[PDB]
Amino acid sequence: FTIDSARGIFPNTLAADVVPATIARFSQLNAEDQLALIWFAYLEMGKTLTIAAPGAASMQLAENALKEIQAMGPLQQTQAMCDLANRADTPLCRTYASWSPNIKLGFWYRLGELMEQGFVAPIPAGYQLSANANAVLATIQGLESGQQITVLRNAVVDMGFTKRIAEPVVPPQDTASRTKVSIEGVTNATVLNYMDNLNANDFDTLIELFTSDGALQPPFQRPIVGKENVLRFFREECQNLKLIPERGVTEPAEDGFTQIKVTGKVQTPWFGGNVGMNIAWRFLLNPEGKIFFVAIDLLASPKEL
Numbered sequence: 001f002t003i004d005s006a007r008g009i010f011p012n013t014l015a016a017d018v019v020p021a022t023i024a025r026f027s028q029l030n031a032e033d034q035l036a037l038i039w040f041a042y043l044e045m046g047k048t049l050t051i052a053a054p055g056a057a058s059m060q061l062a063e064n065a066l067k068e069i070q071a072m073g074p075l076q077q078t079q080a081m082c083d084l085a086n087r088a089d090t091p092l093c094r095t096y097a098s099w100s101p102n103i104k105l106g107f108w109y110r111l112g113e114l115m116e117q118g119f120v121a122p123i124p125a126g127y128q129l130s131a132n133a134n135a136v137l138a139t140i141q142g143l144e145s146g147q148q149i150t151v152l153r154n155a156v157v158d159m160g161f162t163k164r165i166a167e168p169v170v171p172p173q174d175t176a177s178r179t180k181v182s183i184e185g186v187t188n189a190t191v192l193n194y195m196d197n198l199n200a201n202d203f204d205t206l207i208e209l210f211t212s213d214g215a216l217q218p219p220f221q222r223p224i225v226g227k228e229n230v231l232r233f234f235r236e237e238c239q240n241l242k243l244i245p246e247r248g249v250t251e252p253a254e255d256g257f258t259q260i261k262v263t264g265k266v267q268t269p270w271f272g273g274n275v276g277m278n279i280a281w282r283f284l285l286n287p288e289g290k291i292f293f294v295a296i297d298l299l300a301s302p303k304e305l
């Protein structure tokens with residue numbers, strides 16, 4: 001088999017494909033409506049969910065771009081934001097596209113604060129969304145919180161126009177303070193070491209669990225193939241997560257492989273314990289126990305656990 005055919009293991013797993021569906025609809029909207037829709041979603045979400053502050057290093061990396069926008073007149077500030085949403089080719093859009101997701105998120109977090117305070121051009125008073133935009137926002141507001149925050153993050157990541165700029169790599173958790181996960185039905189050492197090393201930010205140990213040609217598929221993304229690319233992804237995008245696997249099932253696969261499905265919850269440091277995303281992991285292990293393929297799926301509902 002191939003990496004691409006391994007994408008088919010456990011085909012009964014119902015992923016929350018409403019998320020990429022909603023992003024596709026969002027992406028069709030007029031840029032000002034995209035910005036207003038997210039503003040509306042963010043303000044209403046903020047009534048029950050508090051977003052964690054961006055990290056200090058992230059803010060320093062975005063500081064020069066933020067200062068440039070803040071110095072513009074209001075019409076130019078709005079144009080710059082529309083440029084990002086339209087994916088226009090401008091210097092600002094190219095800088096934005098060089099950033100990791102967390103830096104992009106912290107950039108918009110700060111702009112949102114400044115818009116609330118009146119120091120950056122706000123969405124116009126009394127703005128009404130287009131017919132298509134209003135329906136997109138309705139869909140978002142009917143989703144589970146874990147799906148709502150995934151829509152927002154994906155919309156942020158998709159902006160700008162395509163070096164790589166990321167936050168510094170955090171030191172792994174010291175061994176004496178690490179916790180160990182417990183998974184009903186699953187004692188497989190590779191799966192357990194995967195969860196535990198990711199929870200400890202121990203990416204150098206984590207990557208050694210993979211085959212040389214192995215791949216990791218994040219939710220609604222294509223597989224990331226090979227140790228170099230997977231390790232880069234861990235270091236740039238996978239810091240400070242909390243994986244809470246609950247239960248799993250283990251089955252033989254072709255050629256002496258083993259396939260394992262685990263379900264549980266994951267927390268992002270942007271929301272902490274206030275949002276638990278419903279997640280499945282689908283592992284395909286070679287005869288020596290190395291990870292040939294692992295897919296991480298956002299599940300359609302808690303009924304998929």
Ligand SMILES: CC1=C(/C=C/C(C)=C/C=C/C(C)=C/C=C/C=C(C)/C=C/C=C(C)/C=C/C2=C(C)C(=O)CCC2(C)C)C(C)(C)CCC1
Pocket residue numbers: 035036038039042051105108109111112113115149150152153156198217218219237238241243266268270277279281296
């Ligand atoms: C834009 C915009 C605005 C600002 C919007 C802002 C500020 C939005 C902020 C949104 C945030 C902060 C969203 C954060 C979402 C984080 C998520 C959804 C993380 C999910 C991570 C997962 C599921 C990890 C899963 C993994 C596992 C478990 C593995 O085993 C391997 C690795 C990996 C695959 C990664 C304003 C308002 C101004 C209006 C104008 C436009």
